[PDB]
Amino acid sequence: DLLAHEFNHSWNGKYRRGADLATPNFNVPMGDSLLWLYEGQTQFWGEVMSARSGLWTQEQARDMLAGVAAQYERGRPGMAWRTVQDTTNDPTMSMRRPKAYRNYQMSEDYYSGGQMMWLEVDSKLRALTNNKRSIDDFGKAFFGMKNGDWDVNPYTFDDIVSTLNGVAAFDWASFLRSRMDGHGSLIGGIEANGWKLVYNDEPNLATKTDESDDKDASLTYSLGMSLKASGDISDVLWDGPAFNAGLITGNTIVAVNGRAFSSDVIKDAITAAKGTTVPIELLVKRLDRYDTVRIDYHGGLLYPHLERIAGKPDRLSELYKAR
Amino acid sequence: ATAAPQDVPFEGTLKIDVDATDLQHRIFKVKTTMPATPGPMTLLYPQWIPGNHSPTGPIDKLAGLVIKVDGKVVPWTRDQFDVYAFKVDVPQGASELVAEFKFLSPQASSQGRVMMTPEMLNLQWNTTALYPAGYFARNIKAQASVTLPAGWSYATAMETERRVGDTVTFKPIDFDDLVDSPMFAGKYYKRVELSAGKQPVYLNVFADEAKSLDAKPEQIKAHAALVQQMDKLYGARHFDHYEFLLALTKKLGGIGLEHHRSSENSGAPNYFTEWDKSWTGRDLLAHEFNHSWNGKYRRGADLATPNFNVPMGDSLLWLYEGQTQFWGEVMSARSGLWTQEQARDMLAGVAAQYERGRPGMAWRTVQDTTNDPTMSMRRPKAYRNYQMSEDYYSGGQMMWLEVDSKLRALTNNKRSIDDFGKAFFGMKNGDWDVNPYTFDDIVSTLNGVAAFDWASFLRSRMDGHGSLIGGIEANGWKLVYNDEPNLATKTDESDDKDASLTYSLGMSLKASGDISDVLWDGPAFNAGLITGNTIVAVNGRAFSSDVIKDAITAAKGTTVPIELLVKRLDRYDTVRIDYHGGLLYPHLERIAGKPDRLSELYKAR
Ligand code: NA
Ligand code: NA
Ligand SMILES: [Zn+2]
Ligand SMILES: [Zn+2]
Structure with missing residues (x-):
């Protein structure tokens, strides 16, 4: 999805840019407040366009989307205190330096969290217009002007709202702020477009590919941690079983x-402990000391997937379909 | 299935020509030439090698064998009931048989001890020889030659006839003495005189690097003192000259092999340059030198076989190796190769080995361990402490210490084991032919020093299951254990950060935590x-x-077990060891009331 992602930025980010981001030279500070459009909707289009173009299969794009949805349904406990809007300050705060809990400190979630909100925006545009308008109409209206122009065309928050309202009348200002300044769910676009995020023991296609050769172990939604093949813990989910x-x-x-x-x-x-009352015994090395912990986790392996809601119209497949 | 060797003359000379230049492949190329007698002929590859007391002949490393009679290839047939015997048919009117083959010496320690390096080599003529069946080996006149790597020096007890370029031709010699005359060769060589006179002794040092050859005067003196101290004991030398062969190396396989007029010895590169760190192994040259008297000159009759391809009887190895182990450590102290404190802590370690480190004594005797060379071939065994392992060495050493104490008690300290050594090995100065003995000869000579039922004494110790350390207390000392480290154990575990815990937790460990040994019935075993x-x-x-x-120290006197997290294959478990005795290392302490005969024994004469 990288090339689809970077290509979309020629429209979203390079040509159209937040006014506080379009600085007069390279030596005055940049205002990142609108990165959830710049990077957020580009993250959205990068994956959608991967499916539309055939860079990804439709099954691959859907499993990719399931991983994003699960990340914000269960993999971001930091949502309780921090908003996606505040993560637009992460480039200057962190500079992608190592942090202990990306899931609790959060980390540039204007990317994937922004992607989820734009998916919900698409579903809301469809709901408001009986599927006659979608986020494609916002893209053409907001970025499709002035063919050939590659000088920066700045925008503000009010311009986003106004263009959204022109596609379908709605209080878009409240909608955008409720997601970006809120602590609630971002994954509403999944069910509104006819699918449901579920978890089972079948591996996610993306996770499976990323842990095949190295033999790593992503256990975020079971034991609340990820491990390298050596047994070294590479990540711990805040308030999860490993954390506790x-x-x-x-x-x-x-x-x-x-x-x-x-x-x-x-x-x-983990599978053998599913449904039982016998804890999992883990022998742990902490610096130069060894101890055994008993983890009372009995939910089994849980990997995210998307499943159809039979009665509802399948707007998600329309969105990911080639035009 | 090979006809017995006969004490009959062998006509002609067995010529053995070795090319030792292929250091990269570690190959010795060999040509053996002998008179060819018409009719069936059987050629033998040496199987039982003197000093190894076992069939160590590396028959599966003999390759490329082609046999020609007067230039014509003759097919050979190996005896399927004697895989060291090659049979050919020599046509009528033939004159000369030539056998050519290669000895593929070890390319890694897994194949045996390495014998070739980029800087040095070790040539053992039994690995590069074929000889006719049906003759006593001593009746076969032989002449050897070797082509060396360019410019290399060499050393051997065998007299040189001529060196032409890099091809050394030795003077004719009896075939059994040829096998007994190994050669070291290398580019970094130093020859040191240890004793002048009519029966001189020299030390030949080869090293991986020339810097290892810088032996200091006081260090050479200790080796010269070893020769003097052996003169005091035996009063005779069983050689016309003696050539120590010493390799200071990390590449050549370790070796300690005795001969009449030489010995093959290996040491670390810091044998001289770090004299204070390399002491635990310095009894080696004293040990091998003593064998020139005890083992080479005098040998058990069942061990002195007529050729290299009939089995050896090891029944009297507790004198051959047992008393040599004894004199090796005593002479180290007498000569200054060891300090008296080092020799005393070594002896304490041996005593503890048989007081507490050999639970296998409950079922097996030291006499039975004389079969260990052929049973085990020094291959890995799980419990050297319970299966036991060649205890005719150190267990024999303790008996000879008790023999010494008994000789003193019987004679009011006027006689000791020194008198046995002179009486049993000190005859016929200059003779280095084998002078065999039996068990009755040992008893008779001991009885000549001091009358006693030595037959019962020897049999009760070697056929018994009781204590072997009685000579310690009889000679005025007592074996004790405390938390102070043993000098040998400390030196042998330092730098590596290893851990010998035989007398506490009953196990030894590497620095990694890998267990390297477990004492039968000890805490780790349990x-x-x-x-x-x-x-x-x-x-x-x-x-x-x-x-x-x-x-271990923190657990001393408490009831809190030591918790050990253990990895067994792919499983981890925690064991609780209820050991509360603390660290225990063996030492010798004086018995105040008794005379100190032990220090007399270890004192220079
Ligand atoms: Na421009
Ligand atoms: Na001889
Ligand atoms: Zn981007
Ligand atoms: Zn020996």
Whole structure:
């Protein structure tokens, strides 16, 4: 999706840019307040255009989308105190330097969190117009002027609202602020467009590809952590089971129920603990000390997928379909 | 299935020509030439090698064998019931047989000890020889030659006839003495005189790097003192000259092999340059030198076989190796190769090995361990402490210490084991032909020093299951254990940060935590631990030698078991060891009331 993503920026980001971002030279500070359009909708179009162009299969794009939806339904506990709007300050705050909890500190969520909101914007435009308008109409109206022009054409927040209102009348200012300044769910566009985010033990296509050769283990929605093949913990979900055992990134899972760690071993132990009352025993190395923790997790392996809601119209497939 | 060797004359000379230039492949190319007698002929590759007491002949490393009679190839047939025997048919009217082959020396330690390096090589003529069946080996006149890597020096007890370029031709010699006359060769060589006179002794040092050859005067003196101290003991030398062969190396395979007029010895590159760190192995040259008397000159009758392809009887190895192990350590102290404190702590370690480190003594005798060379071939065994392993060495050493103490008690300290050595090995100065003995000869010579039922004494120790360390207390000392480290153990575990815990937790460990040895019926054994398991943590803390030792001390006198996190194959478990005795290392302490005969024994004469 990279080339689709970067290409879309020629319209969204380069040609049209937030007025506080379009600075007069390279040595005055940049205002990032509208990055949830610049990068957020480009993240959205990058994945949609990957499916429309055939760079991704339709199944690949849908599993990609399921991972994003799960990230904000369960993988971002930092939503409770921080808004997506505040993450537009992350480039200057963090400069992508290592942080302990991307899931709790949050990290440039104007990308994927913005993508979810633009998916909901598409679903709302369809609902307001009986599917006669969609986010495609916003794209043409907001970026389709002045063919050949590649000088910056700045915009403000009110311009976004006005263009959205021109596609379909609605209090878009309140809608945008409620998602971007709020702490609530961002994934409403999934169900509105006819699908549902579910979790089961079948691996997500994206996660499966990203953990095949290295034999890593992404267990975000089960044990609340990710591990390298060595057993080194690479990420811990805030308030998750691994977190509640005091585990941090850099600790090592040495053994699972007494058996030397492997990705298959810890996954099999999670499956074996599903529905039982026998805790999973993890032998842990913390710096130069070893201890055993008992984790009472019995939900089994949980990987995100999208499933159809049979009665509802399938607007999502229309959105991801080639034009 | 090979006809017995006969004490009949062998007509002619067996010529053995070796090309030792292929250092890269580590190949010795060989040409053996002999008179060809018409009719069936059987050629033998040496199988039982003197000094190894076992069939160590590397038959599967003999390759490329082609046999020609007067230039014509003759097919050979190996005896399927004697794989060291090659049979050919020699036509009528033939004159000369030539066998050509290659000895493919070890390319890694897994094939045996390495014999060739870019800087040095070790030529053992039994690996590069074929000889006719049916003859006593001593009746076969032989003449050897070797082509060396360009410009290399060499050393051997065998007299040189001529060196032409890099081809050294040696003077004719009996075939059994040829096998007994190994050669070291290398580019970094130093020859040091240890004793002048009519039966001179020299030390030949080869090294990986020339800097290792810088032996200091006081260090050479200790080696010269070894020769003088052996003169005091035996009063005779069983050689016309003696050539120590010493390789200071990390590349050549380790070796300690005795011969009549030489010995093959290996040491670390810091044998001289770090004299204070390399002391634990310095009894080697004293050990091998003593064998020139005890083992080479005098040998058990069942061990002195007529050729290299009939089995050897090892029944009397507790004199061959046992008393040599004894004199090796005693002479190290007498000569100054070891300090008296180092020799005393070495002896304490041996005594503890048989007081507490050999539970296998409950079922097996030291006499039975004389079969270990052929049973085990020094291959890995799980419990050297319970299966036992060649205890005719150190167990024999303790008996000879008790023999010494008994000789003193019987004679009011006027006689000691020194008198046995002179009486049993000191005859016929200059003779280096084998002078065999039997068990009755040992008893008779001991009885000549001091009358006693030595037959019962020897049999009760070597066929018994009781204590072997009685000579310690009889000679005025007592074996004790405390938390003070043994000098040998400390030196042999330092730098690597290893951990010898035989007398506390009953196990030894590498710095990694891998268990390297487990004492039968000890605390680690009783937790189900075996060699190859890994101690991962101690009381929850990542393993180190210091960590486990501090935990042993912390567990002393308490009832809180030591918690060891253990890796067994792919499984982790925690064991609790209820050991509360603390760290225990063996030492010798004086018995105030008794005379100190031990210091007399270890004192220079
Ligand atoms: Na421009
Ligand atoms: Na001889
Ligand atoms: Zn971008
Ligand atoms: Zn020996």
